[PDB]
């Protein structure tokens, strides 16, 4: 049928427009945005704390600084590095040489279906053990805060402060699982899938949002400082968006042609 | 008194896709209003129904095709109808479809002529259901479903691929060429040579767009391929 | 609505199960118009 | 017959913030009445809305500021607007705010002149939204939001810092000077020098108070810092 | 507050035959209509009530029996009434019955004469309830339940084995010849010799069919025998 | 119907418990007829 594509708006047609025929029945509605995104998926894998921690310093950190790495996980589909927001995803193709290796993460499915510009939704978290018959706990604090770092002495046994606080802490039995849901607590109204502004008024890095996440999570062993074991331990984190919404179209990744 | 009950064999299991909620932890939160943002998307079909540019090989890829001047009986260009085929790879229809397993409805194709206003010509578009061998001449093409499009004032012309299938729903990827994945070919034929006045550039170019139809539908989500990050 | 199967009973209150926006004082419609 | 049921993946978990109760052990107790105690507090905002004294450095801290006699164009005193700043540290507004994460509404400042009844003068108060560099002269100060206050019979004068923010709610601590934590500066300018009769003490003093506004609000509790015990 | 309950001794058990459902995982799926397929089966009795061919030994198996020309007083053919007997093995009634444990109702037998149209004769069919020894002569056969069938225009003749049992329901297999498994014998007697005109083939053949009755019924499913695969 | 004992309560919705066929727009009867 004759038409002009330069106008931008083109009306969708059917088989009957130019030939003899008829339209098909609806079928099913599995493409609904709310129904599509309510499925759990892996996000990151982190270690388990066995003592009081030292939060990593900002990125301009030079050598020789003492801190703990790979113990904290951010809750956000965007790329991150060293437990802090980033802009470019990383990958170590040559595990050799000096220097500490930076943790990295990303939400492959979310960015494979990230066809829009802005997003908002609640979020449900779950954790799972990767070691046989392990006892652990999980802690959390909201966006725009920091982790207290010190300990107290009870009966000559040091006890880290992160045991107590008015922000959720949860315990699981031998081989159990931890589950709960969180609200949308960032100051911004919506989470930007892609951004092009600056946060600070000067010396800022363009395109790096400040508070595009839900919070922060970590795991620890409920024992005093006197029982620091000899082997490292790991856990896995699962997230699941709930009651999602989208606001403005965009484009999808570039599938390279061999 | 206590209510006596017996848990089933399925207890303490963690199922990712389970259709139910869980226990809250930090409720009673109130959030800013979002009335000010326009253009809320309710279904991804709204985006699947927007035309986009396809790709071809210039031997190293371009969206358009250059009309030659030589005379031959082979089709000017022909590609299969299979959403996993490279030509549809980067278009929205294909990109979204690769995340599901089945589809219905009618696909839509659009063209636009971007040559000098002084040119004149005609083209033939045909769609051939599956056969032992694909069409290779105008005489064969005429018999299948086809239409004639002539250059005039208006620049674009839309074509609809009917949904003719032996079964409801069809696979969106072709591990093997069963009748449920591949559905024939599409080919374009130059009916008459182009006429141009003296002192004009030769070899005009033609452009392609691909989009979903009115009655298009998807179903049965599936996990996605992360190879793009490399 | 959504990937939620229950349709009969809700235990916790709405304001504790979900987040809400504080007040201030069918077929798919198209995107992009021409006039 | 037993009701068949299947427990979820989240069982035997201990969640501190869970919104529900537990099983009693020693019920049926009755307690004395408490009708005789007046002044029940229902919300901590009732206490957040009471003015209190700020602090400054005399170089080793005092709540007031001494008006000099020299003449210069710099502001008499200027401090940032950030609830984590030391000046607000001991005031109730800051002390309570340090236990939460977000806030809204308008902050309020109050002054009182405690000099001899025979003195006369005028002062200029200004509030500068964020910029590359903070104001440093009266000409610049006049342009921002400001007001003129003159010594008279009444002793005190109140000032309100409007809530002008790029987003609803703002952070209550400044790990880094993003636009969501810092919100400009406040500065005081001596418009005219003070006039005193002979045989009177020089260098009068001025006093500050800080309190929450009418539409102030807090949100999202957080755990507190125990360093005070040391 | 939490509802207090105490699970029973039977918890976490997996029971294959339990009459209840389980938790879904991938719901909300919609399937194609199936209105176009005719002949839906609702109960397997519909198939159990269709006649089929039995088998015998020609000494190496055929469904028919050849009428000899010699004269003797023994029954032409006699087989027991026990669904596990080889003769019923391949017929539908027996094949389906082997998957259950009990049965009721009346069995049905049918015959058809496929000889030359010019022949004439008569046959005697009898059914003998259980006894110490099975019948062996016409005089004995006449006393039991029996009927006379004569060759004529119509070719077939149906016979019904009455359900005469000391108890409701009966076993469908005979581990030992208790009165609840075996139920007598069936035998066929040639009353008169066949008459044929000159120049015609001798020794006509007769054919058998077996099927369930009107009031047939099965009960109590049981697991099946997989030996056929070898 | 079927090998299902419950007759009083159903938790999940029908469209999530079972599959359905999307629309388009007693004694046993015999098989095989003669006329």
From Swiss-Prot, chains C, F:
Myristoylation is required during RNA encapsidation and formation of the mature virus particle. It comes from the Viruses. Lies on the inner surface of the capsid shell. After binding to the host receptor, the capsid undergoes conformational changes. Capsid protein VP4 is released, capsid protein VP1 N-terminus is externalized, and together, they shape a pore in the host membrane through which the viral genome is translocated into the host cell cytoplasm. After genome has been released, the channel shrinks. This is Capsid protein VP4. It comes from Seneca Valley virus (isolate -/United States/SSV-001/2002) (SVV).
């Amino acid at each position: 049928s004759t038409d002009n594509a330069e106008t931008g708006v083109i009306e969708a047609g059917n088989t009957d427009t130019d030939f003899s025929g008829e339209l098909a029945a609806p079928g099913s509605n599995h493409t609904n945005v709310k129904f599509l995104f309510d499925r759990s998926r892996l996000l990151n894998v982190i270690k388990v704390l066995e003592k009081d921690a030292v939060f990593p310093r900002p990125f301009p950190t030079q050598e020789g600084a003492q801190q703990d790495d790979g113990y904290f996980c951010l809750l956000t589909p965007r790329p991150t590095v060293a437990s802090r927001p980033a802009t470019r995803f990383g990958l170590y193709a040559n595990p050799s040489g000096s220097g500490v290796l930076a943790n990295t993460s990303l939400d492959f499915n979310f960015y494979s279906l990230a066809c829009f510009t802005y997003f908002r939704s609640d979020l449900e978290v779950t954790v799972v053990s990767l070691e046989p018959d392990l006892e652990f706990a999980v802690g959390w604090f909201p966006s725009g805060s920091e982790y207290q770092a010190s300990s107290f002495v009870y009966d000559q046994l040091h006890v880290p402060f992160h045991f107590t606080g008015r922000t959720p802490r949860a315990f699981a039995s031998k081989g159990g699982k931890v589950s709960f849901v969180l609200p949308w607590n960032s100051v911004s109204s919506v989470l930007p899938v892609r951004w092009g502004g600056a946060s600070k008024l000067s010396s800022a890095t363009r395109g790096l949002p400040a508070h595009a996440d839900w919070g922060t999570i970590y795991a620890f062993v409920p024992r005093p400082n006197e029982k620091k074991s000899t082997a490292v331990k790991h856990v896995a984190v699962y997230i699941r968006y709930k009651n999602a919404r989208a606001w403005c179209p965009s484009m999808l990744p570039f599938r390279s042609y061999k | 008194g206590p209510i006596p009950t017996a848990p089933r064999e399925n207890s303490l299991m963690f199922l990712s896709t389970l259709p139910d909620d869980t226990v809250p932890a930090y409720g009673n939160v109130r959030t800013p209003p979002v009335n000010y943002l326009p253009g809320e998307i309710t279904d991804l079909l709204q985006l699947a129904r927007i035309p986009t540019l396809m790709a071809f090989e210039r031997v190293t890829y371009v969206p358009y095709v250059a009309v030659p001047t030589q005379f031959d009986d082979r089709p000017l260009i022909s590609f299969p109808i299979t959403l996993s085929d490279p030509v549809y790879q980067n278009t929205l229809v294909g990109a979204i479809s690769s995340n599901f397993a089945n589809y219905r409805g009618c696909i839509q194709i659009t063209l636009t002529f971007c040559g000098p206003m002084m040119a004149r010509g005609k083209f033939l578009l045909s769609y051939s259901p599956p056969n032992g061998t694909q069409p290779q001449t105008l005489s064969e093409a005429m018999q299948c479903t086809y239409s004639i499009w002539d250059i005039g004032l208006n620049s674009s012309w839309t074509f609809v691929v009917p949904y003719i299938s032996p079964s409801d729903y069809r696979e969106t990827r072709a591990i093997t060429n069963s009748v449920y994945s591949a559905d024939g070919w599409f080919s374009l034929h130059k009916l008459t040579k182009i006429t141009l006045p003296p002192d004009c550039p030769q070899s005009p170019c033609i452009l392609f767009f691909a989009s979903a139809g009115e009655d298009y539908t998807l179903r049965l989500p599936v996990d996605c391929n992360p190879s793009y990050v490399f | 609505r959504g990937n939620n199967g229950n349709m009969t009973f809700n235990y916790y209150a709405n304001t504790y199960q979900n987040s809400v926006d504080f007040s201030t004082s069918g077929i798919l419609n198209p995107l992009g118009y021409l006039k």
